[PDB]
Swiss-Prot record, chain A:
Residues 1-178 form the BetaCoV S1-CTD domain. Changing residue 135 to A: In strain: Omicron/BA.1, Omicron/BA.2, Omicron/BA.2.12.1, Omicron/BA.2.75, Omicron/BA.4, Omicron/BA.5, Omicron/BQ.1.1, Omicron/XBB.1.5, Omicron/EG.5.1. Changing residue 107 to L: In strain: Omicron/EG.5.1. Residues 99-107 are annotated as: Immunodominant HLA epitope recognized by the CD8+. It comes from the Viruses. Changing residue 156 to H: In strain: Omicron/BA.1, Omicron/BA.2, Omicron/BA.2.12.1, Omicron/BA.2.75, Omicron/BA.4, Omicron/BA.5, Omicron/BQ.1.1, Omicron/XBB.1.5, Omicron/EG.5.1. Changing residue 104 to F: In strain: B.1.1.298. It comes from Severe acute respiratory syndrome coronavirus 2. Changing residue 19 to I: In strain: Omicron/XBB.1.5, Omicron/EG.5.1. Residues 88-159 are annotated as: Receptor-binding motif. Changing residue 27 to A: In strain: Omicron/BA.2, Omicron/BA.2.12.1, Omicron/BA.4, Omicron/BA.5, Omicron/BQ.1.1, Omicron/XBB.1.5, Omicron/EG.5.1. This is Spike protein S1.
Length: 198, 50, 50
């Protein structure tokens, strides 16, 4: 989550109906757009932000949330449009001895901007005493690992979260829905849909 | 500027119409100022609010 | 009460200005009538609503 992966999606036709109709996702929650209207609109600036978090932290992947990974790992803007996708991954991203490959930023001086990534492995000064880049008393590494075990209860089990981020109509669009194009008629009153513009 | 009294009335009426037309471009706190965009993007429970 | 006609105009203008000032002390359903108190007591998602 501190180094969440951002992938650009462009120049493709996207069928979001296979995402709504799939029951694999525990949370399929969209904010600035209806989930069922995604096949009827055209988009550009589509971004997929992929990371792994806890079970109780899936509420913090939302606009306007106060939280820990919201402030120091992954921040969403107040005017965010898109969909947050979360599904349980205890069968894949957990080990009986402890899966420690997923890390979060426990310590930071200030909250992040929306869509800001911090991968800097610099030390934090948690006390009055300066640390000088060396661990010690009140000097801790900012990145700490999750202790994922399959025997743990819900709320702490690993969840895979993908955030789809869009922009609405304010640019030429390259990602569209599976709606078929009709022929054009001249000099008649029609209700048209040009790339999501109705 | 001889006929300024009539031109003031004409300008005031045209300016009032222009302001009234310009006010459609404001979203007033909604996600968009275009009704078609809201009706094509959202379900009726939240489109009702917008 | 000889000059009541001018005094009414002066009183109405002063009273309208005083009422416009006193409307700032009303919260209009918000938690406080002061913007600084709202900005200091709440996060921007709810401070925006207030």
């Amino acid at each position: 989550v501190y180094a969440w992966n951002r992938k650009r999606i462009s120049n493709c036709v996207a069928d979001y109906s296979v995402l709504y109709n799939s029951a694999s996702f525990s949370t399929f929650k969209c904010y600035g757009v209806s989930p069922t209207k995604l096949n009827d609109l055209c988009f550009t600036n589509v971004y997929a932000d992929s990371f792994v978090i806890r079970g109780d932290e899936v509420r913090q992947i939302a606009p306007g949330q106060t939280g820990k990974i919201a402030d120091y790992n992954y921040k969403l803007p107040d005017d965010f449009t898109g969909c947050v996708i979360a599904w349980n991954s205890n069968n894949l991203d957990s080990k009986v001895g402890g899966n420690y490959n997923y890390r979060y930023r426990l310590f930071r001086k200030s909250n992040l901007k929306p869509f800001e990534r911090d991968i800097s492995t610099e030390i934090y000064q948690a006390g009055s005493k300066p640390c000088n880049g060396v661990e010690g008393f009140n000097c801790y590494f900012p990145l700490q690992s999750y202790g994922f075990q399959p025997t743990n209860g819900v709320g702490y089990q690993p969840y895979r979260v993908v955030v789809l981020s869009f922009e609405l109509l304010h640019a030429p669009a390259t990602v569209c829905g599976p709606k078929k194009s009709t022929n054009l008629v001249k000099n008649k009153c029609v209700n048209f849909n040009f790339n999501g513009l109705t | 500027s001889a006929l300024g009294k009539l031109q003031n009335v004409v300008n005031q009426n045209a300016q009032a119409l222009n302001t009234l037309v310009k006010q459609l471009s404001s979203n007033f706190g909604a996600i968009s100022s275009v009704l078609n965009d809201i009706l094509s993007r959202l379900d009726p429970p939240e489109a009702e609010v917008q």
